[PDB]
Enzyme design. Structure first.
Site, PDB file in Angstrom:
ATOM      1  N   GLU A  35       0.811  -1.208   0.000  1.00 58.10           N
ATOM      2  CA  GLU A  35       0.000   0.000   0.000  1.00 58.10           C
ATOM      3  C   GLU A  35       0.840   1.251   0.000  1.00 58.10           C
ATOM      4  O   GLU A  35       0.538   2.218  -0.702  1.00 58.10           O
ATOM      5  CB  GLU A  35      -0.980   0.029   1.198  1.00 58.10           C
ATOM      6  CG  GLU A  35      -2.082  -0.979   1.133  1.00 58.10           C
ATOM      7  CD  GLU A  35      -3.037  -0.768   0.024  1.00 58.10           C
ATOM      8  OE1 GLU A  35      -3.980  -1.673  -0.042  1.00 58.10           O
ATOM      9  OE2 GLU A  35      -2.962   0.114  -0.831  1.00 58.10           O
ATOM     10  N   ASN A  46      -7.941   8.499  -6.114  1.00 56.06           N
ATOM     11  CA  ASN A  46      -8.744   7.459  -6.872  1.00 56.06           C
ATOM     12  C   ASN A  46      -9.551   8.153  -7.934  1.00 56.06           C
ATOM     13  O   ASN A  46      -9.824   9.356  -7.925  1.00 56.06           O
ATOM     14  CB  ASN A  46      -9.625   6.727  -5.900  1.00 56.06           C
ATOM     15  CG  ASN A  46      -8.872   6.102  -4.649  1.00 56.06           C
ATOM     16  OD1 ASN A  46      -9.229   6.265  -3.465  1.00 56.06           O
ATOM     17  ND2 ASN A  46      -7.815   5.347  -4.953  1.00 56.06           N
ATOM     18  N   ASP A  48     -12.594   7.949  -8.603  1.00 53.57           N
ATOM     19  CA  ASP A  48     -13.870   8.421  -8.093  1.00 53.57           C
ATOM     20  C   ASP A  48     -13.780   9.713  -7.300  1.00 53.57           C
ATOM     21  O   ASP A  48     -14.811  10.136  -6.810  1.00 53.57           O
ATOM     22  CB  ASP A  48     -14.598   7.318  -7.306  1.00 53.57           C
ATOM     23  CG  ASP A  48     -14.045   7.040  -5.917  1.00 53.57           C
ATOM     24  OD1 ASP A  48     -12.976   7.627  -5.554  1.00 53.57           O
ATOM     25  OD2 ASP A  48     -14.663   6.373  -5.080  1.00 53.57           O
ATOM     26  N   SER A  50     -12.130  10.162  -4.407  1.00 54.96           N
ATOM     27  CA  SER A  50     -11.672   9.862  -3.051  1.00 54.96           C
ATOM     28  C   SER A  50     -10.133   9.831  -3.101  1.00 54.96           C
ATOM     29  O   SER A  50      -9.521   9.771  -4.140  1.00 54.96           O
ATOM     30  CB  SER A  50     -12.319   8.569  -2.489  1.00 54.96           C
ATOM     31  OG  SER A  50     -11.778   7.452  -3.218  1.00 54.96           O
ATOM     32  N   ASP A  52      -6.739   7.900  -0.861  1.00 56.88           N
ATOM     33  CA  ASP A  52      -6.290   6.896   0.140  1.00 56.88           C
ATOM     34  C   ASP A  52      -5.108   7.520   0.909  1.00 56.88           C
ATOM     35  O   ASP A  52      -4.221   8.194   0.311  1.00 56.88           O
ATOM     36  CB  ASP A  52      -5.747   5.706  -0.604  1.00 56.88           C
ATOM     37  CG  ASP A  52      -6.745   4.938  -1.339  1.00 56.88           C
ATOM     38  OD1 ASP A  52      -7.931   4.994  -1.066  1.00 56.88           O
ATOM     39  OD2 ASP A  52      -6.300   4.046  -2.193  1.00 56.88           O
ATOM     40  N   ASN A  59      -9.233   4.861   2.699  1.00 51.16           N
ATOM     41  CA  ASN A  59      -9.930   5.738   1.768  1.00 51.16           C
ATOM     42  C   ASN A  59     -10.972   6.638   2.376  1.00 51.16           C
ATOM     43  O   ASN A  59     -11.673   6.296   3.335  1.00 51.16           O
ATOM     44  CB  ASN A  59     -10.544   4.954   0.593  1.00 51.16           C
ATOM     45  CG  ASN A  59     -11.803   4.270   0.967  1.00 51.16           C
ATOM     46  OD1 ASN A  59     -12.835   4.885   1.300  1.00 51.16           O
ATOM     47  ND2 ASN A  59     -11.715   3.010   0.991  1.00 51.16           N
ATOM     48  N   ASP A 101     -15.614  -5.043   8.785  1.00 49.96           N
ATOM     49  CA  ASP A 101     -16.815  -4.539   8.071  1.00 49.96           C
ATOM     50  C   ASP A 101     -17.525  -5.682   7.342  1.00 49.96           C
ATOM     51  O   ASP A 101     -18.646  -5.482   6.873  1.00 49.96           O
ATOM     52  CB  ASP A 101     -16.452  -3.436   7.102  1.00 49.96           C
ATOM     53  CG  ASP A 101     -17.585  -2.716   6.415  1.00 49.96           C
ATOM     54  OD1 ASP A 101     -18.346  -2.152   7.136  1.00 49.96           O
ATOM     55  OD2 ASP A 101     -17.600  -2.828   5.158  1.00 49.96           O
TER      56      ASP A 101
HETATM   57 CL   LIG Z   1      -9.106   3.907  -8.133  1.00 51.39          CL
END
Ligand SMILES: [Cl-]
Ligand SMILES: [Cl-]
Ligand SMILES: [Cl-]
Ligand SMILES: [Cl-]
Ligand SMILES: [Cl-]
Ligand SMILES: [Cl-]
Ligand SMILES: [Cl-]
Ligand SMILES: [Cl-]
Ligand SMILES: [Cl-]
Ligand SMILES: [Cl-]
Ligand SMILES: [Cl-]
Ligand SMILES: [Cl-]
Ligand SMILES: [Cl-]
Ligand SMILES: [Cl-]
Ligand code: NA
Length: 129
Positions: A35, A46, A48, A50, A52, A59, A101
């Site tokens: 990561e 990202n 979208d 967002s 990280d 995220n 989750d």
């Molecule tokens: Cl992504």
């Protein structure tokens, strides 16, 4: 902060990640390696919109607030900046929520693709723990 491998293993164990939800320490170290390369200050944007953040690339769509992810949540109740600290407390606490989750460490795509099913104990081999 860029942690050393064994340095990060020890920190994660001290914060109770070792065998958390059944995931051995080497799973966590492996995830952090791919990561962030063990860099607490890692960020990545990202598709979208967002972002990280941190050692475990947590995220902003669900987990933290950065003010710039429309429609998102903040389920760990933290600013995403907390995830970049040299102190891994916030990243670890939030990772405990994520891994609980329902999909376990599959929440980390990189874990699924690069760590799952491999000899993850290699990541803690040698370390004084
Ligand atoms: Cl992504
Ligand atoms: Cl080290
Ligand atoms: Cl390494
Ligand atoms: Cl363990
Ligand atoms: Cl392990
Ligand atoms: Cl918020
Ligand atoms: Cl904000
Ligand atoms: Cl936001
Ligand atoms: Cl921006
Ligand atoms: Cl929320
Ligand atoms: Cl905030
Ligand atoms: Cl720490
Ligand atoms: Cl926290
Ligand atoms: Cl699981
Ligand atoms: Na958010």
């Amino acid at each position: 902060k860029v942690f050393g491998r064994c340095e990060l293993a020890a920190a994660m164990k001290r914060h109770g990640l070792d065998n958390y939800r059944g995931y051995s320490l080497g799973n966590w170290v492996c995830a952090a390696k791919f990561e962030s390369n063990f860099n607490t200050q890692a960020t990545n944007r990202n598709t979208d919109g967002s972002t990280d953040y941190g050692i475990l690339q947590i995220n902003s769509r669900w987990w933290c607030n950065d003010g710039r992810t429309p429609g998102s949540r903040n389920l760990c109740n933290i600013p995403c900046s907390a995830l970049l600290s040299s102190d891994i407390t916030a990243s670890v606490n939030c990772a405990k929520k994520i891994v609980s989750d329902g999909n376990g460490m599959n929440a980390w795509v990189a874990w699924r693709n690069r760590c799952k099913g491999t000899d993850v104990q290699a990541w803690i081999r040698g370390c004084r723990l």
